[PDB]
UniProtKB/Swiss-Prot annotation, chains B, G:
Antenna complexes are light-harvesting systems, which transfer the excitation energy to the reaction centers. GO terms for biological process: photosynthesis, light reaction. The keyword Membrane applies. Gene3D superfamilies: 1.20.5.250. It comes from Rhodobacter capsulatus. This is Light-harvesting protein B-870 beta chain. It is a single-pass type II membrane protein. The gene is pufB. The lineage of its organism: Bacteria, Pseudomonadati, Pseudomonadota, Alphaproteobacteria, Rhodobacterales.
Curated annotation (Swiss-Prot), chain C:
Coiled coil: none annotated. The lineage of its organism: Bacteria, Pseudomonadati, Pseudomonadota, Alphaproteobacteria, Rhodobacterales. This is Reaction center protein H chain. It holds the Pfam family PRCH. GO terms for cellular component: plasma membrane light-harvesting complex; plasma membrane-derived chromatophore membrane. Its main location: membrane. Its cofactor is a bacteriochlorophyll; a bacteriopheophytin; Fe cation; Mg(2+). The reaction center is a membrane-bound complex that mediates the initial photochemical event in the electron transfer process of photosynthesis. It is a single-pass membrane protein. It comes from the Bacteria. Keywords: Bacteriochlorophyll, Chlorophyll, Chromophore, Electron transport, Membrane, Photosynthesis, Reaction center, Transmembrane, Transmembrane helix, Transport. It comes from Rhodobacter capsulatus (Rhodopseudomonas capsulata). Binds 4 bacteriochlorophylls per trimer. Binds 2 bacteriopheophytins per trimer.
UniProtKB/Swiss-Prot annotation, chain D:
Fe cation binds at residues 190, 230. This is Reaction center protein L chain. It comes from Rhodobacter capsulatus (Rhodopseudomonas capsulata). GO terms for cellular component: plasma membrane light-harvesting complex; plasma membrane-derived chromatophore membrane. It holds the Pfam family Photo_RC. A ubiquinone binds at residue 216.
UniProtKB/Swiss-Prot annotation, chain E:
Pfam families: Photo_RC. GO terms for molecular function: bacteriochlorophyll binding; electron transporter, transferring electrons within the cyclic electron transport pathway of photosynthesis activity; metal ion binding. Belongs to the reaction center PufL/M/PsbA/D family. It comes from Rhodobacter capsulatus. This is Reaction center protein M chain. GO terms for biological process: photosynthetic electron transport in photosystem II. A ubiquinone binds at residue 250. The chain crosses the membrane at residues 51-77, 109-138, 141-166, 196-224, 258-284. The keyword Membrane applies.
Length: 54, 43, 245, 281, 304, 53, 43, 54, 42, 50, 42, 43, 42, 53, 54
């Protein structure tokens, strides 16, 4: 809908902005941590194997 | 109705700014996902 | 980093412990300096500036902003001057320092020793709304919800005599706490008795701090429904001074 | 030197012994008869600890250790080179602590305040006497008390705890641990709340106690109050120390096995002991 | 025989205080009530509580963590309510074994532990945000948030940072009454008598000091309640005889004293120190030092 | 049909907050359950399929 | 019976916006489930 | 009997609905967890056996 | 009435609530039929 | 009917609902913990599930 | 009446309560009979 | 107080009945589940 | 305005903030390019 | 274009301090992660390349 | 930017200078210690090897 702007009529922008920032940061950190803990998607390990760094 | 005291015009302006920011963020995320899929697909 | 030393046997644990020692030294300095905002500079027995002032310097002044526009600079000359007693009825017992000062007259009436009071600001303590914090219960809608109601009980002093009856209670409205009992003496005068220095029995209120003769000279409140901080300090000092005197 | 408000409080009276014989100050320190005794006992104990360091042959402050007489000595007064020095130091420490408490009582009487501080200190004195006197004598020897050393008494704590398996399973011990943790938590909260009321956001006026009550009611739905929080902190600390003392009193005197094994009466109640499944079969 | 002011002799009560508005949305506050049993030592009012977003997130995810542990216990009991009560303190939700490292483990082999841990972390972060924002909306100084951050630091070192540095979730403590005590004892045994960890000793010193300082401060305040000493803020801005008598007691006792405001700085730092030093001590164990008694022998406070 | 009257009993603020929290919790729970099942862990499936490590 | 202090038309408008959002969310979920079923059926 | 509606004359709809939602979610999650804890009725395990997943 | 609702307000509330409950129950019945066909538990 | 003159039905209904739910859950758990009356176990035995 | 409810209100509340109780008990009896047929415990 | 009397009586009745039932269940001789299993050969 | 700042003050602050951010991001991009040339991680 | 209005929403001082703290922590974390990985430990790479020790 | 000076209109110079000094000293000490822990860049070890001190 084009009437989604009315969300700012229900909630204060500062509250929502802080909540969204915290949520996005936590989600990004969690996904990066999950990928790093998996050896098949740890990009440092993949780079080491591909380029023969060690 | 209004719980925050903002007028409808102010709400529309704030939403326009927020949607511009959200569109930029989502576009960057989509580009990153395309790059990851090309480099190392997970499906 | 197990066994990895920067030099000799100095490893990450050694660096952490030495850094903690430095931080603790600084923290102790900071905490001691923050606690020197009252009572300084030091004086001698004659009230003159003491030649020794300690190793810790007095910190730079800090300002407290009050709700009524008044500014308090706690480490300042004005703050010390406002809380300084004058014309104390005291006398040195020795030329040397470190000896007690002898009360010249009546210590309880003169307000020295355990009866000492501090000249606090002569205004009532207020809440966040500006209302007086301590008010008699007749001016409120509070009711006794537990314990023993002392209103109407006789008041017995430390010499086993009846000096009057309790007529009202004074309550801290924001905290919902009884702080004073109002007593009508046999002479018709009304006094305020701190709650923390009396006992409520099943049939009487016992005040062991003072005797019957001293009840008549308890400091008074200017207004029947308002008690100021200075009046509170004077009453508490007078009542607490009875244990020694 | 004197504080700017100190002169009107330095009045005679309030002593327990000696009248005005010792009713004076040395610098900031009020002396009194019990202050004289405190200085004597403390100096003697410190110098005897240094002498015990000399006999031990080490000057490292973290290696100095004075040990009590061996368990085989019983309750006898031991030779100074065979544990008697520990007994003398223990007597000096007890005298110093009691004299400190009585000096605090005198200072309270002079200033016209309550005796909550000396009572609370007497609680810690009772704990100390439990560790060095009551329990060793109930076990029949001075050799069960802890030594006077910065880390050797930690070794004593470790050995005493492992005498009964894992000491975590002592119930009074669990209660004392919970009370100590609660005391630390409450101290943190009280300091933080008072400082946040006294130091508000820049540009704001000083907050009232109403602000503190509102804050703690908003955060968790209850506020104990300033008087309430002070009472609660004092009671928490006193109960923590008392129940720690009880936990050490019951260990080795009426209970000698593993506390983890003590915890099995609930499991071994016959109406569900044989029921197969779960952890304990 | 005198009144010691440990319990109120009489209770009074009117309408409950609903709190100052300031910058707080009063729509998020619940109703209030009274509980006379709590009025003997403190306040009888079970006042309104703020709901908001952070509180809702914290409550939901904390309940999720609690119920995850509970359903794991019920699974370990085999649906038997009698086994559930018989072995309640013996049930344990253990972390994944060391073979899986930091990767997601199967449900039966630590996945449930990881799910509960994530729920707990979300709840704790939300509650910290709640503490900070409730301080902010009333115009207060955020001291509570920084004090909470030290405990959060110790908690996250135990469960997150040290497991990451050690390369496996297996080194984290389990969710259980008796099991985490066993974990504590085994940690001490594995790292060579944690008594000889210097930061462990500092943390113990701070804990003992917190108990000692709260005893001192509570006894001092109750001793000067004759002069309204518990009204600490007013004493800070308008010094009375209670503050002076407390300061003089401690100055005559030990030669130095505090102020009505700075004693709380002492208190907050003493209480913060136990968790602040404990986190460092735990983080150093296994990553830098694996045998604290040998380390003490090397560094001159254990016999050789 | 007449379900809009829900907004006559419940304020949107509380309802929206609760719904957002519930959706986040449910999505996280389902994703974690699937990740802890190796047969449905898409990272493990991709590793096996594309020959990673 | 308005506890929220909302009129009938305000409630209808809010419900319309909420239903648009809910429909979008449910459509995305349906597409995701269809894709997962095609890629890796669980029945 | 059509008189059941009178429950709304004695119970507050807001609290009743909140409690009902919480109770229904907890019950549904509990039943799903009970089914999952049983290998015979774990639909993921059944699918793995059926399609030969690893 | 403790809640202060009118009798007609209560009737309308009950009507909409029962419509929603009927939808929920019908969906649950269909789900149970599908499960019974796919994997019966009796 | 006179019981509603004594007890507030709101508290009574809340307590009764909680009590009934807890009792039903307890009985179902007791039956589930008994393999003889565990209906899922009987179902997997009868239908030959894995 | 401590609750403030009149005699008529108490009577009608009891009538609704007993109708609901009778429905609940009938469902319970049917479930018990079905269980007894399927897997008797006596 | 009739209210407290009835509440305490109900709580006590429930606790007593549950206690007796748990005692009987704990005893295999009077555990009706085991008896029924043996009688009907559920095993 | 929640912060109480003006349009002009906010824009003047934002210009300086964006200048600093652009400088920081340019330096970071150069560093990443240099690292990729030296020790590529892809 | 109109994102400057963010400074009409949040106080610049707190935002600046928090952003600086966050950036420093992130940079230190990434550098430590690279150091803890021997493949990207630049000192180890240097000592292998130049034949130190 | 030619308008960076306005940072001093936002933050107190004294606090900024003190924090910067502490931060720079800690960073320099940390980097020096990191170099000392690596024998390939420990200049004292290199000097000992070159001059044959030990
Ligand atoms: C309570 C149960 C155990 C016990 C278990 C532990 C454990 C476990 C630990 C300590 C620790 C310490 N213990 Mg011990 N300790 C006991 C009995 C004592 C007694 C005593 C006479 O009762 C004393 C004085 C000490 C003293 C000490 C300190 C050296 C240290 C920090 C305490 C602290 O800050 O407390 C709070 C008090 C303050 C903050 C105020 C200042 C007190 C100062 C620091 C005391 C210094 C004493 C000095 C070294 C020697 C005194 C004699 C001299 C002649 C003056 N222990 C008994 C036997 N103790 C910790 C440590 O680091 O050990 C190496 C530690 O890990
Ligand atoms: C045999 C066992 C070992 C030993 C092993 C350990 C280990 C291992 C550890 C300690 C730790 C501690 N030990 Mg030790 N310890 C021993 C002997 C002692 C002795 C003694 C003999 O007298 C003492 C006094 C202590 C004292 C202490 C504390 C000083 C220290 C930190 C306590 C704390 O705050 O914990 C508990 C506080 C927390 C965990 C903080 C929690 C913060 C979070 C955010 C709050 C809870 C989360 C959430 C809200 C929960 C739900 C609440 C809902 C309302 C239901 N140990 C011996 C030598 N000890 C810790 C430490 O720091 O060591 C350096 C630690 O990890
Ligand atoms: C509620 C109980 C808590 C508490 C309370 C408490 N302690 C108190 C007080 C209170 C209320 C005081 O008023 C009093 C005081 O003045 O504090 C400033 C005191 C005090 N608590 C102290 C310490 C202390 N309290 C501790 C504990 C606690 N005290 C409890 C947790 C600990 C612990 C756990 O280790 C310590 C170290 C002192 C700072 C002080 C008492 C000072 C005193 O007694 O002074 C006179 C004595 C001397 C100056 C030195 C005497 C030295 C001896 C003669 C020789 C040494 C003997 C000793 C046995 C050697 C030990 C070696 C160690 C390695 C074992
Ligand atoms: C300085 C260090 C000390 C300290 C400090 C400290 N802790 C703090 C604070 C501070 C300064 C806070 O501001 C914060 C606070 O809000 O305190 C009131 C907190 C706090 N410290 C807490 C606990 C705590 N602190 C501890 C320790 C300490 N905290 C240290 C001693 C410990 C210990 C010793 O282990 C504990 C357990 C909390 C009371 C609180 C943080 C609250 C929090 O994080 O909440 C989020 C977590 C949850 C919601 C988890 C779930 C809770 C329930 C189990 C949910 C499930 C039940 C459901 C609601 C009901 C079910 C009913 C039936 C269906 C069963
Ligand atoms: C709100 O109110 C309050 C105050 O005021 C405003 C206060 O200050 C305090 C006190 C707290 C003060 C700073 C904060 C911190 C205090 C302590 C942390 C505990 C640490 C104490 C450590 C060692 C002990 C310090 C002194 C010890 C024993 C005393 C050592 C001094 C002397 C031994 C020598 C004794 C001399 C005696 C008589 C005189 C000898 C001379 C002669 C002839 C004999 C509290 C609690 C309070 O709540
Ligand atoms: C090892 C632990 C024991 C440390 C040695 C004994 C400590 C007591 C020594 C000082 C006691 C004394 O004699 O008091 C007088 C002296 C000077 O006081 P004063 O002149 O008033 O200072 C300000 C004037 N410029 O006193 C002073 O110097 C004032 C400064 C106080 C001394 C700091 C001692 C620290 C006390 C706490 C010990 C633990 C610290 C833990 C704190 C953690 C954070 C809260
Ligand atoms: C050991 C030898 C001592 C023999 C001296 C015997 C005299 C009795 C002690 C005494 O008189 O203390 C008073 C002392 C001086 O201060 P006061 O006299 O009060 O006034 C002078 C200020 N202009 O008041 C004092 O507080 C002395 C000043 C102390 C200076 C540093 C002390 C550090 C070591 C203290 C012991 C630990
Ligand atoms: C284990 O479980 C896993 C992790 C696998 C499951 C993962 C799950 C989830 C839960 C993924 C995400 C769900 C969501 C909901 C993701 C986010 C969707 C959103 C809503 C992204 C929002 C992006 C919005 C962004 C950056 C904000 C753009 C706003 C930018 C500045 C703010 C502009 C608004 C302004 C400035 C105020 C100025 C105007 C005035 C009038 C003052
Ligand atoms: C281990 O033990 C096990 C789990 C095996 C057995 C235990 C079992 C149980 C306890 C099973 C269940 C017992 C119950 C009680 C199940 C639930 C039955 C119910 C009561 C379902 C209710 C469904 C109600 C639903 C969806 C709500 C329909 C209401 C919908 C929106 C709300 C409409 C009302 C409105 C909107 C307010 C607006 C209207 C106006 C006029 C303003
Ligand atoms: C362990 O158990 C498992 C997990 C296996 C199975 C258990 C499963 C369950 C219990 C799954 C789910 C049950 C539910 C109930 C899932 C959720 C269903 C819902 C109710 C989804 C709702 C999505 C709602 C969405 C997107 C709507 C968000 C609404 C909006 C954008 C509309 C905003 C309206 C506004 C802004 C302002 C208008 C104001 C005016 C004045 C017009
Ligand atoms: C485990 O997960 C890993 C670590 C793998 C991945 C996680 C990753 C993330 C989450 C990385 C980063 C996300 C972000 C959000 C990075 C940072 C983006 C930003 C926004 C960086 C901002 C740099 C801003 C900079 C330099 C600007 C500082 C501002 C200044 C110099 C301007 C000064 C402002 C004002 C001076 C004074 C003017 C005053 C007046 C009155 C005009
Ligand atoms: C009938 O009863 C029911 C079923 C209703 C509920 C009964 C429930 C019970 C019995 C609940 C709990 C009993 C216990 C024993 C709860 C826990 C007690 C403890 C002692 C919890 C201790 C946690 C202790 C420590 C260190 C944990 C710190 C945890 C952390 C930092 C969290 C780590 C966060 C995240 C690891 C990892 C994220 C990474 C991924 C890959 C998700
Ligand atoms: Fe305090």
């Amino acid at each position: 809908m084009s009437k989604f702007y009315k969300i700012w009529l229900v909630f204060d922008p500062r509250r929502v902005f802080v909540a969204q920032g915290v949520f996005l940061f936590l989600l990004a950190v969690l996904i990066h941590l999950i990928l790093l803990s998996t050896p098949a998607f740890n990009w440092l390990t993949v780079a080491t194997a591909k380029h023969g760094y060690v | 109705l209004s719980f925050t005291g903002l007028t409808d015009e102010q709400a529309q302006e704030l939403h326009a700014v927020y949607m511009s920011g959200l569109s930029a963020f989502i576009a960057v995320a989509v580009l990153a996902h395309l790059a990851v899929m090309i480099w190392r697909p997970w499906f | 980093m197990v066994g990895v030393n920067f030099f000799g046997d100095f490893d990450l644990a050694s660096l952490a412990i030495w850094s903690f020692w430095a931080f603790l030294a600084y923290l102790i300095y900071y905490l001691q300096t923050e606690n020197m905002r009252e009572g300084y500079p030091l004086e001698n027995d004659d009230g003159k500036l003491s030649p020794n002032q300690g190793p810790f310097p007095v910190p730079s002044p800090k300002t407290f902003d009050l709700a009524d526009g008044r500014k308090i600079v706690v480490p300042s000359v004005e703050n010390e001057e406002a809380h300084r007693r004058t014309d104390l009825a005291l006398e040195r017992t020795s030329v040397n320092e470190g000896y007690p000062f002898r009360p010249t007259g009546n210590p309880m009436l003169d307000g020295v020793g355990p009866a000492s009071w501090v000249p606090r600001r002569d205004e009532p303590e207020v809440d966040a709304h500006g209302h007086n914090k301590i008010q008699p219960m007749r001016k409120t809608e509070m009711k006794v919800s537990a314990g023993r109601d002392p209103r109407g009980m006789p008041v017995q002093a430390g010499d086993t005599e009846v000096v009057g009856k309790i007529v009202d209670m004074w309550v801290d409205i924001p905290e919902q706490l009884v702080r004073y009992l109002e007593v009508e003496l046999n002479s018709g005068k009304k006094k305020l008795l701190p709650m923390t220095m009396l006992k409520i029995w099943s049939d009487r209120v016992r005040v062991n701090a003072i005797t019957s003769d001293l009840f008549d000279t308890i400091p008074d409140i200017k207004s029947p429904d308002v008690v100021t901080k200075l009046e509170e300090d004077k009453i508490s000092a007078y009542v607490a001074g009875g244990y020694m005197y | 030197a004197l504080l700017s408000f100190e002169r009107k409080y330095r009045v005679p009276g309030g002593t327990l012994i000696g009248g005005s014989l010792f009713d004076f100050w040395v610098g900031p320190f009020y002396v009194g008869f019990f202050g004289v005794t405190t200085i004597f006992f403390a100096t003697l104990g410190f110098l005897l600890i240094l002498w015990g360091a000399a006999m031990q042959g080490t000057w490292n402050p973290q290696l100095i250790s004075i040990f009590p007489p061996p368990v085989e000595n019983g309750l006898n007064v031991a030779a100074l080179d065979k544990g008697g020095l520990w007994q003398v130091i223990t007597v000096c420490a007890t005298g110093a602590f009691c004299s400190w408490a009585l000096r605090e009582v005198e200072i309270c009487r002079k200033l016209g305040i309550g005796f909550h501080i000396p009572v609370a200190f007497s609680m810690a004195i009772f704990a100390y006497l439990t560790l060095v006197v009551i329990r060793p004598m109930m076990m029949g020897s001075w050799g069960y008390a802890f030594p006077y050393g910065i880390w050797t008494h930690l070794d004593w704590v470790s050995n005493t705890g492992y005498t009964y398996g894992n000491f975590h399973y002592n119930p009074f011990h669990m209660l004392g641990i919970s009370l100590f943790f609660t005391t630390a938590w409450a101290l943190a909260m009280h300091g933080a709340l008072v400082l946040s009321a006294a130091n508000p956001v820049k540009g704001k006026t000083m907050r009232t106690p109403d602000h503190e009550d509102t804050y703690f009611r908003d955060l968790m739905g209850y506020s104990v109050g300033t008087l309430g929080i002070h009472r609660l902190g004092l009671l928490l600390a006193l109960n923590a120390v008392f129940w720690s003392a009880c936990c050490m009193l019951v260990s080795g005197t009426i209970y000698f096995d593993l506390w983890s094994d003590w915890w099995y009466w609930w499991v071994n109640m016959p109406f569900w002991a044989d029921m197969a499944g779960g952890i304990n079969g | 025989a005198e009144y010691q002011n440990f319990f109120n002799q009489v209770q009074v009560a009117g309408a409950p205080e609903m709190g100052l508005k300031e910058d707080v949305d009063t729509f998020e506050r619940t109703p209030a009530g009274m509980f006379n049993i709590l009025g003997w030592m403190g306040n009888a009012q079970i006042g309104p509580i703020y709901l908001g977003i952070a509180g809702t997130v914290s409550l939901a995810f904390g309940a999720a963590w609690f119920f995850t542990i509970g359903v794991w216990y019920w699974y370990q009991a085999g649906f038997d309510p009698f086994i559930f009560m018989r072995d309640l303190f013996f049930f344990s939700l253990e972390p994944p074994p060391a073979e899986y490292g930091l990767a997601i483990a199967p449900l039966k082999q630590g996945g449930v532990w990881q799910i509960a841990s994530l729920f707990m972390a979300i709840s704790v972060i939300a509650w910290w945000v709640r503490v900070y924002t409730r301080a902010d909306q009333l115009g207060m100084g955020k001291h509570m948030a920084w004090a909470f951050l030290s405990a959060i630091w110790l908690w996250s070192v135990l469960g997150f940072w040290r497991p990451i540095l050690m390369g496996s979730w297996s080194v984290a403590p389990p969710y259980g009454i008796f099991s985490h005590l066993d974990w504590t004892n085994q940690f001490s045994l594995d790292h060579g008598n944690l008594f000889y960890n210097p930061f462990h000793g500092l943390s113990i010193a701070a804990l003992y000091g917190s108990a000692l300082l709260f005893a001192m401060h509570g006894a001092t305040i109750l001793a000067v309640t004759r002069f309204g000493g518990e009204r600490e803020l007013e004493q800070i801005v308008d010094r009375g005889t209670a503050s002076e008598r407390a300061a003089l007691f401690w100055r005559w006792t030990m030669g130095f004293n505090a102020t009505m405001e700075g004693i709380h700085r002492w208190a907050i730092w003493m209480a913060v120190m136990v968790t602040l030093t404990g986190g460092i001590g735990i983080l150093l164990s296994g990553t830098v030092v694996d045998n604290w008694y040998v380390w003490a022998q090397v560094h001159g406070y254990a016999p050789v």
